[PDB]
């Protein structure tokens, strides 16, 4: 269930890809995240990725959306 | 910080 404490716990992991505080999520932020998690994907795979979630096509990632894919998968407990 | 880990393994 999506609780009042849960929202502020995504905005928490929000936060953490959005450095200067815009509310959207570009693939500089993405890179930079990416590249401190270990990995280094490609612009044309953070653009990929962005698309996943992105589903305006906008080439943005902002809270709203990004609560849709978080709760897509929390929803599922199996 | 857990928890921001499992969060973030949920964003890829």
Aim: hydrophobic residues 35%; without cysteine; negative net charge.
């Amino acid at each position: 269930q999506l609780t009042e404490e849960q929202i502020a716990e995504f905005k928490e992991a929000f936060s953490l890809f959005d450095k200067d505080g815009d509310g959207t999520i570009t693939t500089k932020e993405l890179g930079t995240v990416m590249r401190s998690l270990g990995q280094n994907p490609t612009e044309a795979e953070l653009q990929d990725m962005i698309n996943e979630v992105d589903a305006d096509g906008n080439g943005t990632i902002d809270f709203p959306e990004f609560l849709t894919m978080m709760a897509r998968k929390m929803k599922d407990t199996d | 910080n857990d928890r921001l880990q499992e969060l973030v393994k949920l964003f890829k």
